[PDB]
């Protein structure tokens, strides 16, 4: 179970399938890092601005906040990636940077449609990402 063709996933209370594969690509999206830095990462895949394995990284520094990983999974209505395996953690030691998209259910859209960076871990090296978007709705257009 979990996923199909991979890079989408399925309500498992609705067999409702998401496909964030119009999201996918070397391409990426961005979020943006605060005021100073801009995230650079690919959903499932590897990112341009990364090299052949990472999927996310940043735009100014080129830490690399993430690897490629398509297994999107629905989890607690958000369906959540994570990039893990990062630049190593500057914080702690034996650790590495990862990302946690967590692609939000909302009706609502972003004026672009952005992966929206909650906030950093810097304890653990996380950088929480939550991508409000209609694309993982289905659930909360009812609530």
Known sequence: SN???????????TG??????????RAGFTA???????VYMSICGENENCPPGVGACFGQTRISVGKANKRLRYVDQ???LVYKDGSPCPSKSGLSYKSVISFVCRPEAG?????????????????????????????????
């Open 16 to 25: 409702h399938l998401f496909d964030l594969s119009s999201l996918s690509g």
């Open 111 to 143: 004026p672009t449609n952005r992966p929206m960076l909650i906030s950093l871990d810097k304890q653990t090296c996380t950088l929480f990402f939550s991508w409000h978007t209609p694309l993982a709705c289905e659930q909360a257009t009812k609530e």
């Open 32 to 38: 943006a890092y605060s005021e100073k830095g801009l």
């Open 78 to 80: 958000v369906l959540q």
């Open 3 to 13: 996923e199909h063709d991979d890079c989408q996933v399925t309500n498992p209370s």
